[PDB]
Coordinates of C-alpha atoms and ligand atoms in Angstrom, one line a residue:
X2 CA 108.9 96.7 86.8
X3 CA 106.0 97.3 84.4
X4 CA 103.1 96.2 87.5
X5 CA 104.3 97.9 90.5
X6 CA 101.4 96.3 92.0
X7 CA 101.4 92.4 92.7
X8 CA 97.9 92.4 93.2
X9 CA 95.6 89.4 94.5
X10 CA 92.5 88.2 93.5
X11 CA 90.9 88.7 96.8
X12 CA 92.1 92.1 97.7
X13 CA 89.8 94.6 98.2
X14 CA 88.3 96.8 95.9
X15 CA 89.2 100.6 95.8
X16 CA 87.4 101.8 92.9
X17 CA 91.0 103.3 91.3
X18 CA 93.0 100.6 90.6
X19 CA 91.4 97.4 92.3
X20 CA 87.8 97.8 90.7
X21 CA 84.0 96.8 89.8
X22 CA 83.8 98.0 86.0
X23 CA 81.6 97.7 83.1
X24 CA 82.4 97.9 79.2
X25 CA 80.7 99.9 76.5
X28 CA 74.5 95.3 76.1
X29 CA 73.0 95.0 79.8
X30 CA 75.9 93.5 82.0
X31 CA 77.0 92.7 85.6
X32 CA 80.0 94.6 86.9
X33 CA 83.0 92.3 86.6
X34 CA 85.9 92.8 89.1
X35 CA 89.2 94.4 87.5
X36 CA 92.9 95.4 88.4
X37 CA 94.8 98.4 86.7
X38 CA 97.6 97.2 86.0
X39 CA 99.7 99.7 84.6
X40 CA 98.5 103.1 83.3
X41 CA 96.0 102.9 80.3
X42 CA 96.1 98.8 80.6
X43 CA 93.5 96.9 82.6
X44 CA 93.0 92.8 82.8
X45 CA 89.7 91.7 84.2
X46 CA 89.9 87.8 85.1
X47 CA 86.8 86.7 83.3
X48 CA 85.7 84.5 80.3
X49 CA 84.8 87.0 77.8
X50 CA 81.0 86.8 77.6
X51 CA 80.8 90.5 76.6
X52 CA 82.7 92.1 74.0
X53 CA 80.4 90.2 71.2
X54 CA 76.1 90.0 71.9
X55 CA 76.7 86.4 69.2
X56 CA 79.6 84.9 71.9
X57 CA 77.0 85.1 75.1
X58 CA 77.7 81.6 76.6
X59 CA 80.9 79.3 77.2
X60 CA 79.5 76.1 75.4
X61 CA 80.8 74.7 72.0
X62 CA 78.6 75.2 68.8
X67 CA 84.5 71.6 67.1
X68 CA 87.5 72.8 64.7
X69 CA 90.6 70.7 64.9
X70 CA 92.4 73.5 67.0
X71 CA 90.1 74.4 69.6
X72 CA 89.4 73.7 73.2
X73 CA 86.2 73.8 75.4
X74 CA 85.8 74.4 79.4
X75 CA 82.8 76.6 80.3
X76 CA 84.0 75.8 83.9
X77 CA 87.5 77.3 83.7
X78 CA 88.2 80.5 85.1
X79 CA 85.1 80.5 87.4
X80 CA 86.8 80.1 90.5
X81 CA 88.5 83.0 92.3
X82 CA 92.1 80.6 92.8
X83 CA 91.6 80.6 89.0
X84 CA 91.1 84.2 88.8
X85 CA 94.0 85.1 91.2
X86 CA 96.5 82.8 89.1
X87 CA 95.2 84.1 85.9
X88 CA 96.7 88.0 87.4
X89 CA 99.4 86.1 88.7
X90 CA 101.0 84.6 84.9
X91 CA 99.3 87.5 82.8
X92 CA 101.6 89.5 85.2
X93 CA 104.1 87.5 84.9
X94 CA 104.0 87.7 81.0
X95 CA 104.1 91.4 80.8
X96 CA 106.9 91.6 83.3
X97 CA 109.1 88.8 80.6
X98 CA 108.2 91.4 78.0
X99 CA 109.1 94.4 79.2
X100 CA 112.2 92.8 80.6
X101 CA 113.4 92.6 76.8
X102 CA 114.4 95.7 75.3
X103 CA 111.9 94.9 72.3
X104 CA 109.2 94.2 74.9
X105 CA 109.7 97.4 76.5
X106 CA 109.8 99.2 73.5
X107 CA 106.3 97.7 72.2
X108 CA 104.8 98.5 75.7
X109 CA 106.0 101.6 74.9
X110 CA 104.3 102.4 72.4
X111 CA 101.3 101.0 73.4
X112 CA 101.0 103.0 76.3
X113 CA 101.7 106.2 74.1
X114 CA 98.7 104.7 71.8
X115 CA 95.6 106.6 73.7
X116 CA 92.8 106.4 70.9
X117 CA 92.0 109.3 69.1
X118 CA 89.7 112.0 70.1
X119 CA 87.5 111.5 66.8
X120 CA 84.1 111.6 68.7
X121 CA 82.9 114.9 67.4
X122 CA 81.0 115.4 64.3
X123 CA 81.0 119.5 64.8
X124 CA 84.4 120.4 63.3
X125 CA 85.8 122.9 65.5
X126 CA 85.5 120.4 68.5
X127 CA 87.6 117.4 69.7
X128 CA 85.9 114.5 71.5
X129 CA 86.5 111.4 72.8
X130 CA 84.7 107.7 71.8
X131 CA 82.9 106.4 74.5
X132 CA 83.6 102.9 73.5
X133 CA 87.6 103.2 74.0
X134 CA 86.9 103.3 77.9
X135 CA 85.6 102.0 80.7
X136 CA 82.8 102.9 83.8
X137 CA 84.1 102.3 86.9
X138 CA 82.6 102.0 89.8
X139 CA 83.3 104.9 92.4
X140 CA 83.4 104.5 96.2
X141 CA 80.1 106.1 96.5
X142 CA 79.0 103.8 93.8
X143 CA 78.4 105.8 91.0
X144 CA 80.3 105.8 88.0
X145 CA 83.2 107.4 86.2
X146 CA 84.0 107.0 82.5
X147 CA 88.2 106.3 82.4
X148 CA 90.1 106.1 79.2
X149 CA 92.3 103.1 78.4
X150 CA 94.4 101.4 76.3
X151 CA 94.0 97.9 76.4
X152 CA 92.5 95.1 78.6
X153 CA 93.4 91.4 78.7
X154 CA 90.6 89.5 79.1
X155 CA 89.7 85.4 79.4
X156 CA 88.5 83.5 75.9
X157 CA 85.2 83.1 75.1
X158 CA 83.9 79.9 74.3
X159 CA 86.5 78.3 72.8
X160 CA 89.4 78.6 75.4
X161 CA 92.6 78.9 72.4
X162 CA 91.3 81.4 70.8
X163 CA 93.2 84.1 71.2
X164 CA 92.7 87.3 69.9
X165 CA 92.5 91.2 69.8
X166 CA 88.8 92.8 70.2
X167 CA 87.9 96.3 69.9
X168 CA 84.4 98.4 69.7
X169 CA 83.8 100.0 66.4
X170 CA 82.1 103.1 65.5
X171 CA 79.1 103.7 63.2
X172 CA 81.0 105.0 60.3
X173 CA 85.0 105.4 61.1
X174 CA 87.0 102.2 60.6
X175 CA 89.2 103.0 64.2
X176 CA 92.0 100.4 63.5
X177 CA 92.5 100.8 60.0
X178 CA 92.2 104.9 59.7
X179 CA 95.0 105.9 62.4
X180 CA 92.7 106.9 65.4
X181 CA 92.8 103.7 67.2
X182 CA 90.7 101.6 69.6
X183 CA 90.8 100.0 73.2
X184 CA 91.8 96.6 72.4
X185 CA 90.4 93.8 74.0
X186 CA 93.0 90.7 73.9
X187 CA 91.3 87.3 74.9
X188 CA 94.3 85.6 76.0
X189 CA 94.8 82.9 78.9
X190 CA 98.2 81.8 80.1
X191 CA 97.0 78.8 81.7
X192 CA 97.1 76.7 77.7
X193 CA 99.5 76.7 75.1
X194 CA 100.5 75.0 72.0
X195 CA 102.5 72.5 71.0
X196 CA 104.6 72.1 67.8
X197 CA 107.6 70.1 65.6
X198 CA 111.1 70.8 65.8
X199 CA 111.5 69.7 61.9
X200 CA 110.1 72.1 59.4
X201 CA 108.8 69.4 57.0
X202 CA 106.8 67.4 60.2
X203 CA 105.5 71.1 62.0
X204 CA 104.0 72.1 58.3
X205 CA 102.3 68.5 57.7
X206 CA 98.9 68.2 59.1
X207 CA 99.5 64.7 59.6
X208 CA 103.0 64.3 61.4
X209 CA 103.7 65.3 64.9
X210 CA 102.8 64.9 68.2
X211 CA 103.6 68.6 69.9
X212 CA 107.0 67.9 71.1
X213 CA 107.7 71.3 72.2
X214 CA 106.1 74.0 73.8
X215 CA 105.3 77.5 72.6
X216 CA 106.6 79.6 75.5
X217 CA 103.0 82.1 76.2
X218 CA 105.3 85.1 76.6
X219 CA 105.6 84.8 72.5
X220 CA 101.8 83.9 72.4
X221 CA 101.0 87.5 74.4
X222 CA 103.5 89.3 72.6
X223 CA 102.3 88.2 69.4
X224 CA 98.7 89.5 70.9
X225 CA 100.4 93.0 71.7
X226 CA 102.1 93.7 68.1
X227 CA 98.0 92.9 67.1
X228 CA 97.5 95.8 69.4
X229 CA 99.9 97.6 68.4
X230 CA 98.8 98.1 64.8
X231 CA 94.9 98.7 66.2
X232 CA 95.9 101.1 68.6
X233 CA 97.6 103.1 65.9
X234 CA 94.8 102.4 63.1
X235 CA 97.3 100.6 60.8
X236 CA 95.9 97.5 60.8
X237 CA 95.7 95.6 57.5
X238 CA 91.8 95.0 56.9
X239 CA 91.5 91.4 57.3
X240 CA 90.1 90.7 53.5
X241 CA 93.9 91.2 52.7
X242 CA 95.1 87.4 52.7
X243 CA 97.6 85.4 51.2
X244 CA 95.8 82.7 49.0
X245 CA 98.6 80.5 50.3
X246 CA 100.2 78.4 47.3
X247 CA 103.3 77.5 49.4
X248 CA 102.2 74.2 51.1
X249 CA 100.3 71.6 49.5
X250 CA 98.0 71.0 52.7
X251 CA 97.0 74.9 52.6
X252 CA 96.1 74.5 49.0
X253 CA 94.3 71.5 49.4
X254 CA 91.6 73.0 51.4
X255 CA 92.1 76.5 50.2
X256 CA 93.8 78.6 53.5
X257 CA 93.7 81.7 53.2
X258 CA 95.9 83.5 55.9
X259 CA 95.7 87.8 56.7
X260 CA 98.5 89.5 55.8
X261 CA 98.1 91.3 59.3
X262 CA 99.2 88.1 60.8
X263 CA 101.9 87.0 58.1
X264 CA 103.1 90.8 58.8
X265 CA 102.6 90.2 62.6
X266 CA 104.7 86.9 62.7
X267 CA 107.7 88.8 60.6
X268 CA 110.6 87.3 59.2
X269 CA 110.2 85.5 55.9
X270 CA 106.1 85.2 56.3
X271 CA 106.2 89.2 55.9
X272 CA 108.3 88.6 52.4
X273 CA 104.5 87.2 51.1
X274 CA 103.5 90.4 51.3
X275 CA 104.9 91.8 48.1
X276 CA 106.8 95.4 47.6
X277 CA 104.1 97.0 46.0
X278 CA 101.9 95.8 48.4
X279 CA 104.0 97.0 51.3
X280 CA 104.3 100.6 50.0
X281 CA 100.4 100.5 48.9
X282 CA 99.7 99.8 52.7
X283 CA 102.7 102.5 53.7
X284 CA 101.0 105.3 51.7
X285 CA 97.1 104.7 52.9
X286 CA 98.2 105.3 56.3
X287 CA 100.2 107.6 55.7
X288 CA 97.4 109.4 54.3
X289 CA 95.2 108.7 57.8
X290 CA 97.9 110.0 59.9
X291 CA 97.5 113.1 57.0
X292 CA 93.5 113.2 57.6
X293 CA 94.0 113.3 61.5
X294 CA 96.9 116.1 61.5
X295 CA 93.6 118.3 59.5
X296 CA 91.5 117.2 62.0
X297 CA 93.7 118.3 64.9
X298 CA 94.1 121.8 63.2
X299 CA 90.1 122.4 63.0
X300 CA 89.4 121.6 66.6
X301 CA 89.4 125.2 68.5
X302 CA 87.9 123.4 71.6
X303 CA 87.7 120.4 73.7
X304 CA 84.6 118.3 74.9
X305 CA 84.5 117.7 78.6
X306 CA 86.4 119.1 81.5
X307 CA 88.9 116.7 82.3
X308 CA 91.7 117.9 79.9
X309 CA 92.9 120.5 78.2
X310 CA 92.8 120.8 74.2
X311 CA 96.3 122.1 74.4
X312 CA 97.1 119.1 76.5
X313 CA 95.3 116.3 74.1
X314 CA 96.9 118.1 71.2
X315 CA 100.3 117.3 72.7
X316 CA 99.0 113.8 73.0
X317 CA 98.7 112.7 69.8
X318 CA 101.1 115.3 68.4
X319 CA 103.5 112.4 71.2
X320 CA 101.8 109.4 69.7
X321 CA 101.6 109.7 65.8
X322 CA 105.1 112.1 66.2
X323 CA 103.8 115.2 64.1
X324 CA 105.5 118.4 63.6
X325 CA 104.2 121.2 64.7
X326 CA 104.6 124.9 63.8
X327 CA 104.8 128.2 66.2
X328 CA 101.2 128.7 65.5
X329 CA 100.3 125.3 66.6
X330 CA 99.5 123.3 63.0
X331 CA 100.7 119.8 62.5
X332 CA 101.7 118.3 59.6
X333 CA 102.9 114.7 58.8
X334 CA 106.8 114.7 58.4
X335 CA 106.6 111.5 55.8
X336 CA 110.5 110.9 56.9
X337 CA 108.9 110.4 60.7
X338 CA 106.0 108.7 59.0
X339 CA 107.8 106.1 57.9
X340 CA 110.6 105.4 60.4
X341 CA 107.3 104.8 62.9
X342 CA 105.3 102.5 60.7
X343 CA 108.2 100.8 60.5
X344 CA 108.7 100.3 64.1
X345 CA 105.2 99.6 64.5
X346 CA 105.4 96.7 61.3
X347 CA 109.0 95.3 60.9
X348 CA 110.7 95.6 64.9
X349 CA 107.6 94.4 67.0
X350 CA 107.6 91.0 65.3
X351 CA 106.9 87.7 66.9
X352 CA 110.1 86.3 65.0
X353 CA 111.6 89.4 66.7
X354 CA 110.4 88.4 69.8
X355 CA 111.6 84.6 69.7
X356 CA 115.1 86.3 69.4
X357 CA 114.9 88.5 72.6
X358 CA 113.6 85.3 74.3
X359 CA 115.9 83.2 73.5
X360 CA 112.9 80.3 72.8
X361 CA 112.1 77.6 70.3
X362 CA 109.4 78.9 68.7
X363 CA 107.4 77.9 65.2
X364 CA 109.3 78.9 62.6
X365 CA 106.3 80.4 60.4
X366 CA 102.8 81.0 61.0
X367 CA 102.0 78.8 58.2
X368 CA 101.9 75.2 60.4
X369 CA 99.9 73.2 61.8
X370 CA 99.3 73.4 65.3
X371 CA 99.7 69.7 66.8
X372 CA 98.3 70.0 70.5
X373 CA 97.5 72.1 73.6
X374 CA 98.8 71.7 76.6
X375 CA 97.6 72.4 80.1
X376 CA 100.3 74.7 82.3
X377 CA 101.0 76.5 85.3
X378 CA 103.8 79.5 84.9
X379 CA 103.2 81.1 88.7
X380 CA 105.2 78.9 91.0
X381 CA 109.1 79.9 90.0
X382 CA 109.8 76.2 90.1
X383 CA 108.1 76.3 87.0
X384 CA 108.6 79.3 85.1
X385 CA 110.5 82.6 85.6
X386 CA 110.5 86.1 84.3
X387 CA 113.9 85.8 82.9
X388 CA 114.2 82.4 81.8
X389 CA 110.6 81.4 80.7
X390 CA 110.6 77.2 81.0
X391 CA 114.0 77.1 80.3
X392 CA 115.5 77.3 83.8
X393 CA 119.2 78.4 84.6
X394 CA 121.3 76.2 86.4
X395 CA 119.2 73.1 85.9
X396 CA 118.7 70.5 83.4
X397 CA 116.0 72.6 81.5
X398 CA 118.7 75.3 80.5
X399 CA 120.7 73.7 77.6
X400 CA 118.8 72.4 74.3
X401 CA 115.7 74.6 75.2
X402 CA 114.7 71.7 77.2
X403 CA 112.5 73.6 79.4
X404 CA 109.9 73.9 76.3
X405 CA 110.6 70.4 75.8
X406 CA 107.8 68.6 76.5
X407 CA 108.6 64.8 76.9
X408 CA 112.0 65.9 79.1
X409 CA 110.1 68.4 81.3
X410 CA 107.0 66.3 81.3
X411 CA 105.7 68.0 84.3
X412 CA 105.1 70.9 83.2
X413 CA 103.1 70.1 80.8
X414 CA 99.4 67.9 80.6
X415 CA 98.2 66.9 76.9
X416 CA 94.9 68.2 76.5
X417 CA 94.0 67.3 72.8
X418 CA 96.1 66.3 70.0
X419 CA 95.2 68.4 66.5
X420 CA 97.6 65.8 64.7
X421 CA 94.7 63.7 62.5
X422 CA 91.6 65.8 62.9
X423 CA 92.8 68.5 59.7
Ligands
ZN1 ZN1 97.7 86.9 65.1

């Protein structure tokens, strides 16, 4: 198992792994379970991460969904541990899901606090304070928390603190990563290509299966944690689809990359080895780095020990004498990884799901779920239960045929 705790909402705090935290303005203490080393979910709307996002109220976009209620309540807040571990138990059940988790895990942000050379230090804003069980605080390193949407309860996203100068998930070091992410919602979409691409066709027939939704969420990570993100002014001016062009959508190429399959093929071959060789060249600046820190910040870890860290993480050679160097053969077979295997097209595969067939849709509804009881959803099978009716035809996902499963929140179809 990935959580060998299955923890309720209700159980009482320990200050190690069941705990009041806080996150690097003023803030209460929210309550938060450590799920699995380096990766903490606190069930909470997220009115933190961003001073602008404050409140739970809408300023509506077609694809969006409001509820400053949701998620108050602590049967909300137990359920919400409940699927989020659920999710991550479907994922690492995969062999691509364990591998991404993997990696993520292995991700720690860099050490690239100092501004005296000859030191390595951590960024306070890749951890969190936790509160002790004399009620002081410790600072704890981590890798990633999931954490409730803001306002608007479909956006989903990865969040991370920046620093005052260093880009942290576009240089190589890395970031916490924040993912809003419920798995109480998800979308629905078109069977046909040519209706799932038309903004004006399509009810939401099927249902995107949230494992996908929080995998797709985790390759974000993935690239952040690692500081190969693509910076998000690098879009496709999509010219593939009339209804794109008509009102000008732009889309990232960190999510066409994210999504894979043919979406990644809009990102050109020049492009691709453009974006290869600039992080290559972080991974580079980090290895000189390393080599010019003769001692450690702080007490609670060796330099010897930190060096073998990200030496582990970013796989760099290292000499008798202790230098690293970038072996560009290692480089590459690890941006690759990182890039082309953790895909969400990858992912649909493992699963075994319907799934949109590109990220460049329209999204036709959302849909009101429940994935705790097993009656409903299982680590293994998703919607798609074994043994019953919902097996064959991905009929689980089917919305209309397992009708229960599912409650119509708003339809998207007409408002584009
Ligand atoms: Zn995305």
């Amino acid at each position: 198992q990935f959580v060998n705790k299955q923890f309720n909402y209700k159980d009482p705090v320990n200050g190690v792994d069941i705990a009041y935290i806080k996150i690097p303005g003023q803030m209460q203490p929210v309550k938060a379970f450590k799920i699995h080393n380096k990766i903490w979910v606190i069930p909470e709307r997220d009115t933190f991460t961003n001073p602008e996002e404050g409140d739970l109220n809408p300023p509506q976009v077609p694809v969006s969904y409001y509820d400053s209620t949701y998620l108050s309540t602590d049967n909300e807040k137990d359920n919400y541990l409940k699927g989020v571990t659920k999710l991550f138990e479907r994922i690492y059940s995969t062999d691509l899901g364990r591998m991404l988790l993997t990696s993520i895990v292995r991700g720690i942000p860099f050490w690239g606090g100092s501004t005296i050379d000859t030191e390595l230090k951590v960024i306070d804003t890749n951890c969190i304070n936790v509160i002790q069980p004399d009620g002081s605080y410790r600072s704890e390193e981590l890798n990633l928390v999931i954490i409730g949407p803001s306002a608007d309860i479909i956006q989903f996203e990865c969040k991370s603190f920046g620093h005052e100068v260093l880009n942290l998930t576009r240089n190589g070091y890395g970031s916490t990563q924040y993912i809003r992410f419920s798995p109480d919602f998800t979308f629905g979409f078109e069977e046909s290509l040519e209706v799932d691409t038309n903004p004006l066709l399509g009810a939401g027939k099927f249902a995107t299966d949230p494992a996908v939704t929080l995998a797709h969420e985790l390759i974000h990570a993935g690239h952040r944690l690692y500081g190969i993100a693509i910076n998000p002014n690098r879009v496709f001016k999509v010219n593939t689809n009339a209804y794109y062009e008509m009102s000008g959508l732009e889309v990232s190429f960190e999510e066409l990359r994210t999504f894979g399959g043919h979406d990644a093929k809009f990102i050109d071959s020049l492009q691709e080895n453009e974006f290869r060789l600039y992080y290559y060249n972080k991974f580079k600046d980090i290895a000189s780095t390393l080599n010019k820190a003769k001692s450690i910040v702080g007490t609670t870890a060796s330099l010897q020990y930190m060096k073998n860290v990200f030496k582990e993480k970013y796989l760099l050679s290292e000499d008798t004498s202790g230098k690293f160097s970038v072996d560009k053969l290692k480089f590459d077979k690890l941006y690759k990884m990182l890039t082309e295997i953790y895909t969400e097209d990858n992912f649909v595969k493992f699963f075994k799901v319907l799934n949109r067939k590109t990220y460049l849709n329209f999204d036709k509804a959302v849909f009101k779920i429940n994935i705790v009881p097993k009656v409903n959803y299982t680590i293994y099978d998703g919607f798609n239960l074994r043994n019953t009716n919902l097996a064959a035809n991905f009929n689980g996902q089917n919305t209309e045929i397992n009708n229960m499963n599912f409650t119509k929140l708003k339809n998207f179809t007409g408002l584009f």
